[PDB]
Structure formats: structure tokens, C-alpha cells
Amino acid sequence: PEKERFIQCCADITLELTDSLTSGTTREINLNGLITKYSKKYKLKQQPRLTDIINSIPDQYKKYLLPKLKAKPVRTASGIAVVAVMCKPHRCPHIAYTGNICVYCPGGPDSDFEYSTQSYTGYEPTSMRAIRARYDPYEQARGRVEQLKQLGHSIDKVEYVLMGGTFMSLPKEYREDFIVKLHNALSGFNGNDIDEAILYSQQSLTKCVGITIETRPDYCTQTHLDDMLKYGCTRLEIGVQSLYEDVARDTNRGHTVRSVCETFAVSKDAGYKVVSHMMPDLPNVGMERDIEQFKEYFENPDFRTDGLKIYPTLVIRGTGLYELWKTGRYKSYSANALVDLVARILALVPPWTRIYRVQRDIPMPLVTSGVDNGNLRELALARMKDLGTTCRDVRTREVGIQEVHHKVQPDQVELIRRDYYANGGWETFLSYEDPKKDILIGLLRLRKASKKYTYRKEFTSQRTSIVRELHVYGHQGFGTLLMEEAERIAKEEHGSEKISVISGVGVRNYYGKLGYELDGPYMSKRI
Amino acid sequence: ECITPEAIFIGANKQTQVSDIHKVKKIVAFGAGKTIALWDPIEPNNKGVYATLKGHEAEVTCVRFVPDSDFMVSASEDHHVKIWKFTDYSHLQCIQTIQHYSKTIVALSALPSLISVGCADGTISIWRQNIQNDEFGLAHEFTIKKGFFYPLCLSLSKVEEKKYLLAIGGTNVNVFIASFILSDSGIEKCRVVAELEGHEDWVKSLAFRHQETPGDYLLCSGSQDRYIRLWRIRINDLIDDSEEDSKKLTLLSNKQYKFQIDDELRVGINFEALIMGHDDWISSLQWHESRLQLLAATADTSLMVWEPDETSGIWVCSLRLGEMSSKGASTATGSSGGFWSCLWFTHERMDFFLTNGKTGSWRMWATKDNIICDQRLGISGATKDVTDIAWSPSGEYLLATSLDQTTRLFAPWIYDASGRKREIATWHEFSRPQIHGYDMICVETVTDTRFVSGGDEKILRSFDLPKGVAGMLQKFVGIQFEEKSEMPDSATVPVLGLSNKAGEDDANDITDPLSLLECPPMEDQLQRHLLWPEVEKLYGHGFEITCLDISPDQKLIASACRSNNVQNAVIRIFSTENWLEIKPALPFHSLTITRLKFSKDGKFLLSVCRDRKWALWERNMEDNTFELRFKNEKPHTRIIWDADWAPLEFGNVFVTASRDKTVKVWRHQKEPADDYVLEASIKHTKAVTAISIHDSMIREKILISVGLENGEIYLYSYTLGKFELITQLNEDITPADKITRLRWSHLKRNGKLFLGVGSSDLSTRIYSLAYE
Ligand SMILES: C[C@H]1O[C@@H](n2cnc3c(N)ncnc32)[C@H](O)[C@@H]1O
Ligand code: SF4
């Protein structure tokens, strides 16, 4: 027949590999060749894959033999599987009180697309997954985690992302339902009450190690921050796009830069970690001001956020930019010019700031004018090497990508500690790194809760240092070392009586063995 | 009384034990939003749900029929555990309420005069009924780990005459086992006596088996790790240890937990079997009445039945169902997202399997011995609030919508496939025109084949009646559509975009009685490939459309969208011929137009909104444009909700209903000028929401049906000036939540009036009234 011999070929491959691996012996010819020698007796197009054979192993043998094919730390060991979901399409808040929507957001509810949420084009993989789930969080989460399971990953720490427009502009009942649904699809609990859902997810297997909620500076007030900390949010993503007030004004942005900075301060003093969006090639900017703002961003001790997202301005049909690009009022950059600009910007990224992404993955056939290729960071790093300078980004110095791309191993770990001042607070940045090769092995941020901006009833009662983020990628007793040094710092360097770590609800038990007791939404510990 | 609930259509909840079946008199009771619901699945005339026992306030999680007793316990997310007793042979009345736990109640299992309640705070409370009166007293409450183990499932058994076990599954890979004795006024010797181990993940559900052999029985525990584990409970003198003085070399996973209940009933619970390969979680599992068959209902849209191998003493897949392509709340791709709780009961030679379909609809499977299994009719109903109830043009069928993204076409079952009319008309779900991607709000009938709907968006779509449902209705309900077989074929769910395509090219005939359906459609068919193609969407609105109406002329359709200012509180009118719009607007309101009605005479349009003011617009016969004719300033103090047009025979007169707890009837007058001054007014105790008036005159008085915000429906007769209370509907025959839509059926079959009710209690009711 056509395909039956393929199924029985996979079956014999599975049984033979299990038998060989029980006593500790490897294969010889990368089973696909052995697969064909039996299944392609007539050569009827039977093409297996690694996922195909993985979905054949029996459960008892699957759960024990699967990770013996993957070894990248963040891939299967650290296992922070970024599982992105989307909310129902809706119109972003500012449109009401200004008159029109942001002038560069493609898609939405009233664009040429009837189906994609705001700032989305309904062609990214996430959009098709959302629509094939009809924007329901339960199906989204279950399907994504199941697809990840099928592809042979041993995922154990799901990290949620809530993409799409401003999620914070929805009726409170709807958001409560969304978050409860996410946690339920993770843990398996089938309840409806946010408190119970959190309490169940905390014990859950497949821990919800956090959740990110991209939002707007205005919709991040005290009450909104309390809401998102109730949900379990751990990292915020804030739209900025410009430090020049004129650009924000001309883009129908609807929020002043001063508002952005105030929101940064109060959120970082609420224990969050903020990742900001920074659009180059905004109208009326030019290369000189582009470089100026990106050089000030890390120089002004007011923004200095921990993450970043460089999103070069892409014009797409239907936006407010098509009725301005067609008239020729605005012309984009040049390919070489923009690659060089990205190179110079990345040259200035301090070691603590992590570059989470570069230019959007909106498809080439749809963009009217902007970035040509889709591998901008590749060319940026090549041009960086050409110029001589090098990148200090966390993502460009973490162990995991090095072991598979650079194929360089770490052997000179040493303790390094930065100590800067951002958003009115004193932020320490501990790390275990490789000074000779500039490889970051583990990191931990830390902040002295500033009197001016802190507001949480847990923090204003007594002096407090917040462990805003702890991350270990590639014996291996590092989290312990970093946590101990942070304790020492908060006891002597900071003079704080109670040190508390914000944590995703999934990982709240890990700090339990460290002696932390659960206070509100934080894992705290007195000193 | 002359008012009887003809049909109820409620959707099951999504918890893991929403449903339970009364065995000695097979009756399936399942939670549905705020209420419970009764059902006979083996009625000779195939009726679905017939009574919704209200009384809770939040979603009903767990319902359990106390075996060998006339009791059933229900648990609500509003921290209430209620006990219900059979009063009628087929009805129950609440007797006892337990308010405690300050939290949601998750697990809830009951035995004769002995129930167990698991509180999500992490407590297990055993309750024993008082001997003297039918009332439960809190016997004993205890906790495990106090901050780590929260319960997920519970089940208990009567091991001896006055000794009881309790198996707790929860946020732990170890099943806890407690034992106690009953002292006829309480319980004692209670503590966790064992922690069975062998699971690696959470324990979703567990269930003991009947002690058909004294001294030994079986307990199954299904986990989230796609495993099931069978444990052998052996009482004293049957424990059958291993002689240890000669080394038998037992494995550690075969450890036997021995414990003393009081001091002497040595129980030697030992693991017995490992059931493999469920492909996803085990949402619900349940034994059989007699045979040694175990039913496992999984979350991979699949349900299967294991039995011991007759050869090797192990367990294999006896039966499996659910392989028909579907995904519970979706249908494009299956795989993780299907079946909730399961019930398994046998009639004469018929093993009925009953299962929640993650869409508010039950699914039946009747099989004769072990192999030949076929789908029997189930029930349906929305899971979210139901908003609009549009009657077919002459009351032939009922179109319903919901806040859940679905609209559904119901009709009564009258003519069998043979041809002769049946005995009693049973209503069934006949089509699902829209599996949409927006919060469906406002639907209205264009004609027998066309219907226009609008959910949560700036546009509104018109659909035609496809060949499948139309032919099948003509077969069953015997509907006459002028035989016009130029209607498009049955549609599908689009795998691209949202506008409902024709489905001619793709569908993965049936109208004929020789097809696979001899009864109303089946769930797989209904949700996968019984949709409706779309004709045209009608742009023009800015915000989400809120209210919609059709003029009787079937030319102009009047629409409005939710707003907050005058520039968006305008009303648009669309011509059905070109599907385009009218040029001007009719702006008087400033808030969202709640109800918008077209008169019996197609020349007067009634608008009403949150401005607490109504308005009436003329119509230009020549140009199909409207202009302001009448307006009001303070006809009500609070908001107005719905306004309705009285029959032309009673004259040019309409009515408004408002949150002043009041309703005002306005009839035209010409003494100082032309206007419709308030001829009548009534005031109720609760805010009134919906009002419906029969199109037909009866004995010089119109029939006005009003609906309250707590669900109590009133029927009134209105002559000139005076309003006569026909009746009010008792608590047994009303929804538990706010009434959102009331519509009198234009049809009158067998001398009865049908009233369509759609409530926020996730339920649509059909009422029959006798008036000849
Ligand atoms: C999602 C992030 O991308 C920004 N953004 C908005 N429009 C575009 C576009 N056309 N291309 C790239 N990024 C864009 C949003 O403003 C936010 O900063
Ligand atoms: S600019 Fe911000 S608020 Fe405006 S559409 Fe884009 S994401 Fe939404």
C-alpha cells in the first residue's frame, strides 16, 4: 500500500530503538535511512520526520527517551516555552479621545482585515492559531502546548504572552475570564474564580513561570498594576516608539513621554520588569535623531529599561501611513542605511539590557516599504564585526544560542555586578559571566524600592529590596549563589529588612525551599 | 393552569462532574449555569430537559445523586451546597442549604446519609444526615498539608456496616485515603490512613466499584498524565499477603498499604493494574452497574471503554467513540478540547453513553451488546447568555442567538420520516447557522429563507436557507417553502475569513428520508456541516451593532450601533434589494439605542435608548426615507429597555418598558394635536425588561407578555385604559436570571399560543398557552 508500511516502519523503528536504548546503546545510521530500507520497498513518497517517529514512542518509554535528543538549555532544559496567545479583536483606547487610531498600526478591527486584532495582519502563525481557535484562550493554550509536546519538547515551564492591541482596555469580567482560562488550560483545574485558579496553578505541573501583558503607559495606573499583579503578570511591555514629543504628537499616539517615564518608574517600583518598544524610522525623525534617541535612551537614567524591542517602521496598506506614504510626504530609509543604523544602535546596548527582538515578522509580500529581508539582526551583527565593535546584549551573550550557533563552551565563569540608577531607583544587576569570551551564564536583577514611587502595602510598611528577575540558562548551583549574594546585598548594601521576589505563579514553590513565605502576590522573606 | 413549558433549551456547564444520573429511576441531572437541569434520555417521545431547579447564584459545579435515597446534592461557585429531595415522581424541591467554606466547592460525593464536600481552600468536610429528620449536620472537617494539597475529586464507599473509606485526589501525585466509622450522631476514628503512590501528575478523577464480592473490590484513579491506575481493596481474611519468610522479591511499586480502620478491620489495599494510552487527560471515569467494564471519558474529544483481557488478565480497549472529526468548542482540528463528564447507564439491552460536548450539547451513544453503537438524539442549549429570539415569519421555527458566538434554529418535531404526524410535538435543535467569531447580539428574520444577524462588530450579515436544513425540515416539520429548490447548498465553517461561504466545493442527499438521519440532526452533523451560506454583509456602522429590526414590507432594515455621543447614536436604514444603505441618518438620541421596532404599518419607526426618551419617525413612501414625527422628553425616569407595537386592529398604539419598574402604553390622539400620549401605566416590584404583544386580537383585548429582571414572567390582557392580569408564572416555570427577549409566535398550532423566551440564564424557553 501507500502509507500503512510507513506506520509499521515507524513501529518497528520505535520498538528496536527502545530495545537498543534499554541497555545503553546508540543507533548507527540515523534511523531515516534504516526507515527507508524497509518502508520504501516501492518508494511511494513515504517521508518520515523526527516529530513523526517521536509521536510513536509508548508513554512509559516516551517520557524517558524524548529529552535524549535535545540538549540546548533554553530549548528543553530551561524550558521557558514562549506560548503566545491573543485576545479578541478590539479598538485600542486612544481612538476615542483623539479622533483616529495610531498612524502606523496595520490591521485591526476596521482595516482591510476583518479578523486580526489591532496591530496585527492576520498572517503571523499566532494569528492563524488564534482564528482556528476563534480567539478563545482555552483552545489557544491547549493547542499551543500540545503542539509543543508533539514536537518532542519536554516543556515544563510555560511562559505566557498576551499579544494583540491593548489587552488592558477590556471589561474586567472579560479579562478575569481570560486569565482564569489560561491558568486552567495550563493546570487542568476547571474553575472560574481567579483566586482559586491561582492557588491551583501554583501547585500545578507545567508551571506558569510568568505572563507578559503588552499595554499602554496610560492604562498602567496603580489600580491597573494591582489588577495585573492579581492575574500573575511578571513582565510588562510598554509602547514608547519615540522620546521626542513631537513624533508622538504627530503619530496620534495619545500619551506624552513624561507619562511613559512616570509609568516606567511606578511599574518598576511595583516589582515588575518592563520591556519597551522603540520604533526607528518614525516620520520626521531622520537618521541623526534616530541615533540621538537611541543613544539617550540608555544615557538618560530615567528610562534605562531592562528589555527592548527595536521595530523599524513598516508601512502597510490601509494604515494611516499609506495615506501619507502614497503622497510621498514620507520616504523610508535605505536597506544599507538601516542595517548600519541597527549596527550602531546595538553597539550601545549596555550589558544588562536584553534585546528581545528586532524588526517585526510581518510578511514581506504585504509590506509596502520598509525592511527588505527578514534576517535584519544577521546583517546587523555582520556589519558590527565589519566595524570592529561588538554587541553586549544579553540575548547575544547568553549560553544557549552559543552552544548551537557559535558552538563555544564556557570555562571561565566569574562574578560580575553592575549597579546603576534607573527610574529613580538604585538597580543592581548581578551575573555570573565569562570575562574572556563575554558569555553570560546567570543573571539576577535587584532594586531598592524608592520612597518616592513605591506604593504597595507590602513595601511601604518597611524598607524592601525587590528581586525583580532571576534567570539561569546554562555543577549548576547558580540560582543559589545569586540569591545568597542578593540576600547579602539587601542586608548590608541596601539596608532592607524584608526582601521580596515577584514571581510567576508557577514558580512560587521554588522560592519555598529558599525560605520565602508568600505575602500577597510576592514571595517575601524578612531579614 | 393553561400555561405549560413546551420546550427548554439549556446548555451544560464545563466542569468535570456537572452531571449525575439517578439509577433506580434513570434521570440525568446536570448543572447549567445558575441552575440544575433534569432530563429523561429514554422517553418514548424523545423529550430533552423539562425543568430547571433554580436556587443557586453561581455556576453549578458538581451534582451528585445520593445513592439508595431520594436526595441529590448540588454545589455552587457561590459557596453553597444545597440538598434537593424528590417531591414529585419527576421533580425535586430544595430542603437544606449549607452556607460555609467561604470558597468554591470543587469535589462533592455522596452516600446514603453520608456526603463529602471538598472546599477549594483545601478542606474535606464529611456530613452525616440526622436520623430524626431529613437534614445534614456537619460531622467532621479535616485538612491535608494545609497549603499544598487542594482537592480536585472525591469519592467514598461503604466498606463495612459502620465503616467508610474516602479516596481524595488533588494537587498531588499521591491519592490520599482516609477511613472512619459512623457513630449514628457523628464520625470518629478519622484520619488519613494511606497515600497511594504511582501517579506522576495530578489526579483528575477517581471512583470506587461496587462490592459485588464481599471483602474485595476495585478503585480506579485517572491522572493528568494520561494514565489510569487500578487498586485492589481487600478486606481482612481476603488480604492475601505474600509469605515473607521465603523471599518472593516483590517490587516497590507493588507495595501494599495495610491499615486498621478502628483496630481490627485490616485493609490491605494493593495496586492492581496500569491502563495506558489515553492521549490526553482523563476528565471523567466511571464504572458499570454490573459488568467489569471501566468507562474513561478523556479531553481529546474521545470516550472509550476498557475491560480485562480474557487471556492475559490485563486491560484493552473494548470500545471507542468520538473519532468523528470535532474539537468540542471547535471542529476544524480535534486533538485536546472535547469531552467533559460522562454518564453510562443500561436500558434493556442498550448501553447508553451520555457526554458533555464542550458546546452545551449532550451526546448519546446507544449500543446493543459491545460493538454496534449508534448515535441517538440528545439535547442542546447555549452556554452563555441568550439575547435575541427571532420568530420565523409566521412562527414556523425559532432563531436564537447568544453571547456565546453561535446562533441556532429550533423547530418542533411533528411528522416522522414515515409521514404520519407524531403524538406530542418535541422541539429539537435543527440547525446552527453561525459558529461565529463575535459576540452574537441581534438577529432578525427577513423571510422564510433569509435572515439577518449582527454580533459584536460594525457589520451585519444576511444568510439564505441552505438545501440541507430546508429539505430536512420539510421532511420532519413539514415546512412548505414553495418547493423553490434554487436555494444554495449546505455551507461549512470557513477555514479562512469569517463570511459564511456556500460550501458547495467543500463539505468535510441528506434531506431524503433514506439518508442517515431519521430524526432531528446529530451533533457532529450539526456543528460541522449544517451551517448556512452568507449572502451579503452591510457596512456602514462604526461601532458594534446593538439593535436590529426588519420592516414588514421586507424592504428596509433598521439598525443601530452602541455609542456614547450623538455622532455615533444615529440610526441607519438598509435597502434589502441592493444591500446598501440610506443616505441620511435619524439623529435624536445621544446614548445606545436599546430597542428599535418597525410598526405593523411600514411607515412608523419606533426608537428608544438609554436617554430614557422614545421617538417615532415617519417614512416617505416615495423615497423610503424617514423624518422625525414624534418625540418625548421624560416618559420615564430611569432607562428604557424594550418597546413593542400593538396590533393594527387595536390601533396605532405602542408600549415602552423601563427600569422605573414600570411600563407605559401610548395610543395616538388628535384632540390638541397629533401624538401618542400615555394611555396606560403599570408599576411592578422589580425592573421590567422585555414586553411582547400578540399580533392577533382576542376578545377585544390584546395579550401583553412582560418579563422581569429576576425572571418572573407576567401575562396581561389589555383593553382600553385598563390592563387585566391574565396570570403570573410560578417559580417552577421561569428562568432564574434577567429576561432579555420575549416574542409571541405568529403561528397558532393545535389551538395554542407559543411564546419564545430568551433569558440571561443561558436558556431559551418555549411556552404554550391554551386560549381558544
Ligand atoms: C507591537 C509594537 O509594534 C509597534 N508597531 C505599530 N505599527 C507597526 C508597524 N507597522 N511595524 C512595526 N511595528 C509597529 C506598536 O506600536 C508596538 O510598539
Ligand atoms: S499605537 Fe498602541 S494603542 Fe494605538 S493601535 Fe498601536 S498598540 Fe494600539
CSV table of N, CA, C and O and ligand atoms in Angstrom, one decimal, chain A residues 102-107 118-120 164-165 214-215 237-241 253 276-279 282 309-316 319 321 359-362, ligand 1:
chain,number,residue,atom,x,y,z
A,102,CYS,N,-3.7,55.0,16.0
A,102,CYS,CA,-2.2,55.3,15.8
A,102,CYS,C,-2.0,55.2,14.3
A,102,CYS,O,-2.7,54.4,13.6
A,103,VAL,N,-1.1,56.0,13.8
A,103,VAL,CA,-0.9,56.2,12.3
A,103,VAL,C,0.0,55.1,11.7
A,103,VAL,O,0.2,55.2,10.5
A,104,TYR,N,0.4,54.2,12.5
A,104,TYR,CA,1.3,53.1,11.9
A,104,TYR,C,0.8,51.7,12.2
A,104,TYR,O,1.4,50.8,11.7
A,105,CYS,N,-0.2,51.6,13.0
A,105,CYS,CA,-0.7,50.2,13.3
A,105,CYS,C,-1.4,49.6,12.2
A,105,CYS,O,-2.4,50.1,11.7
A,106,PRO,N,-0.9,48.5,11.6
A,106,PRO,CA,-1.6,47.8,10.5
A,106,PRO,C,-2.7,46.9,11.0
A,106,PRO,O,-2.6,46.5,12.2
A,107,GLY,N,-3.7,46.7,10.2
A,107,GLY,CA,-4.7,45.8,10.6
A,107,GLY,C,-5.6,46.4,11.7
A,107,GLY,O,-5.6,47.6,12.0
A,118,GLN,N,-5.9,44.3,16.7
A,118,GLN,CA,-5.2,45.5,16.4
A,118,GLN,C,-3.7,45.3,16.3
A,118,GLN,O,-3.1,44.4,17.0
A,119,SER,N,-3.0,46.1,15.5
A,119,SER,CA,-1.6,46.0,15.3
A,119,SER,C,-1.2,44.6,14.8
A,119,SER,O,-0.1,44.1,15.1
A,120,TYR,N,-2.0,43.9,14.1
A,120,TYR,CA,-1.8,42.6,13.6
A,120,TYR,C,-2.4,42.4,12.2
A,120,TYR,O,-3.4,43.1,11.9
A,164,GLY,N,-1.4,41.3,21.0
A,164,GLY,CA,-2.6,41.9,20.4
A,164,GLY,C,-3.1,43.1,21.1
A,164,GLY,O,-3.7,43.0,22.2
A,165,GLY,N,-3.1,44.3,20.4
A,165,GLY,CA,-3.6,45.5,20.9
A,165,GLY,C,-3.3,45.8,22.3
A,165,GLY,O,-2.3,45.4,22.8
A,214,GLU,N,1.4,43.1,27.1
A,214,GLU,CA,1.8,44.3,26.4
A,214,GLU,C,0.6,45.3,26.5
A,214,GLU,O,-0.5,44.9,26.4
A,215,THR,N,0.9,46.6,26.8
A,215,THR,CA,-0.1,47.5,27.2
A,215,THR,C,0.3,48.9,26.8
A,215,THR,O,1.2,49.1,25.9
A,237,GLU,N,5.1,45.1,28.8
A,237,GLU,CA,5.7,45.5,27.5
A,237,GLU,C,5.0,46.8,27.2
A,237,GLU,O,3.7,46.9,27.1
A,238,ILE,N,5.7,47.9,27.1
A,238,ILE,CA,5.1,49.3,27.0
A,238,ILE,C,5.5,49.9,25.7
A,238,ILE,O,6.7,49.9,25.3
A,239,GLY,N,4.5,50.4,25.0
A,239,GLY,CA,4.8,51.2,23.8
A,239,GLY,C,5.3,52.5,24.0
A,239,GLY,O,4.8,53.3,24.8
A,240,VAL,N,6.5,52.9,23.4
A,240,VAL,CA,7.1,54.2,23.5
A,240,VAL,C,7.3,54.8,22.2
A,240,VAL,O,6.8,55.9,21.9
A,241,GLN,N,8.0,54.2,21.3
A,241,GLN,CA,8.2,54.5,19.9
A,241,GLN,C,9.0,55.7,19.6
A,241,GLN,O,9.5,55.9,18.5
A,253,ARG,N,-0.4,59.3,18.9
A,253,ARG,CA,0.0,58.4,19.9
A,253,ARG,C,-0.9,58.5,21.1
A,253,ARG,O,-1.4,57.5,21.6
A,276,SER,N,10.4,47.8,26.6
A,276,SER,CA,9.8,48.9,25.9
A,276,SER,C,10.0,48.7,24.4
A,276,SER,O,10.9,48.0,23.9
A,277,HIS,N,9.1,49.3,23.6
A,277,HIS,CA,9.1,49.2,22.2
A,277,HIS,C,9.7,50.5,21.7
A,277,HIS,O,9.4,51.6,22.1
A,278,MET,N,10.7,50.4,20.7
A,278,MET,CA,11.5,51.6,20.3
A,278,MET,C,11.4,51.6,18.7
A,278,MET,O,12.2,50.8,18.1
A,279,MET,N,10.6,52.4,18.1
A,279,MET,CA,10.5,52.4,16.7
A,279,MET,C,11.5,53.3,16.1
A,279,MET,O,11.5,54.5,16.3
A,282,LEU,N,10.6,56.5,12.4
A,282,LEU,CA,9.4,57.2,12.5
A,282,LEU,C,9.4,58.5,11.7
A,282,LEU,O,10.5,59.0,11.4
A,309,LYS,N,12.8,46.4,22.4
A,309,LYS,CA,12.2,45.8,21.2
A,309,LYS,C,12.4,46.9,20.1
A,309,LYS,O,11.6,47.9,20.1
A,310,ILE,N,13.3,46.7,19.2
A,310,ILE,CA,13.5,47.6,18.1
A,310,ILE,C,12.6,47.1,16.9
A,310,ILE,O,12.8,46.0,16.4
A,311,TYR,N,11.7,48.0,16.5
A,311,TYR,CA,10.7,47.7,15.5
A,311,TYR,C,10.8,48.7,14.4
A,311,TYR,O,10.1,49.7,14.5
A,312,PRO,N,11.6,48.5,13.4
A,312,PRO,CA,11.7,49.5,12.3
A,312,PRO,C,10.3,49.8,11.7
A,312,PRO,O,9.5,48.8,11.6
A,313,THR,N,10.0,51.0,11.4
A,313,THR,CA,8.7,51.4,10.9
A,313,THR,C,8.4,50.8,9.5
A,313,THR,O,9.2,51.1,8.6
A,314,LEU,N,7.4,50.0,9.5
A,314,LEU,CA,7.0,49.3,8.2
A,314,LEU,C,5.6,49.9,7.8
A,314,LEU,O,4.7,49.9,8.7
A,315,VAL,N,5.5,50.3,6.6
A,315,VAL,CA,4.3,50.9,6.1
A,315,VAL,C,3.5,49.7,5.4
A,315,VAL,O,4.1,48.9,4.7
A,316,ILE,N,2.3,49.6,5.7
A,316,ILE,CA,1.4,48.6,5.2
A,316,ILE,C,0.1,49.2,4.7
A,316,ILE,O,-0.3,50.3,5.2
A,319,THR,N,-3.3,51.5,6.6
A,319,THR,CA,-2.9,52.2,7.8
A,319,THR,C,-3.1,53.7,7.6
A,319,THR,O,-3.5,54.2,6.5
A,321,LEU,N,-0.5,55.5,7.5
A,321,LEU,CA,0.7,55.8,6.9
A,321,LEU,C,0.7,55.6,5.4
A,321,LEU,O,1.5,56.1,4.6
A,359,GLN,N,13.2,43.8,14.0
A,359,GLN,CA,12.1,44.1,13.1
A,359,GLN,C,11.0,43.1,13.1
A,359,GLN,O,11.3,41.9,13.1
A,360,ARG,N,9.8,43.5,13.1
A,360,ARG,CA,8.6,42.7,13.1
A,360,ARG,C,8.6,41.6,12.1
A,360,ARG,O,9.3,41.7,11.0
A,361,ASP,N,7.9,40.5,12.3
A,361,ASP,CA,7.9,39.4,11.4
A,361,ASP,C,6.7,39.4,10.4
A,361,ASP,O,6.2,38.4,10.0
A,362,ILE,N,6.1,40.6,10.2
A,362,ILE,CA,5.1,40.8,9.3
A,362,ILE,C,5.6,40.4,7.9
A,362,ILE,O,6.7,40.8,7.5
C,1,LIG,C1,3.6,46.0,18.7
C,1,LIG,C2,4.6,47.1,18.6
C,1,LIG,O1,4.9,47.4,17.2
C,1,LIG,C3,4.5,48.8,17.0
C,1,LIG,N1,4.1,48.9,15.6
C,1,LIG,C4,2.9,49.5,15.2
C,1,LIG,N2,2.8,49.5,13.9
C,1,LIG,C5,3.9,48.9,13.5
C,1,LIG,C6,4.4,48.6,12.2
C,1,LIG,N3,3.7,48.9,11.1
C,1,LIG,N4,5.5,47.9,12.1
C,1,LIG,C7,6.2,47.6,13.2
C,1,LIG,N5,5.9,47.9,14.4
C,1,LIG,C8,4.7,48.5,14.5
C,1,LIG,C9,3.4,49.0,18.0
C,1,LIG,O2,3.3,50.4,18.1
C,1,LIG,C10,4.2,48.4,19.2
C,1,LIG,O3,5.2,49.3,19.6
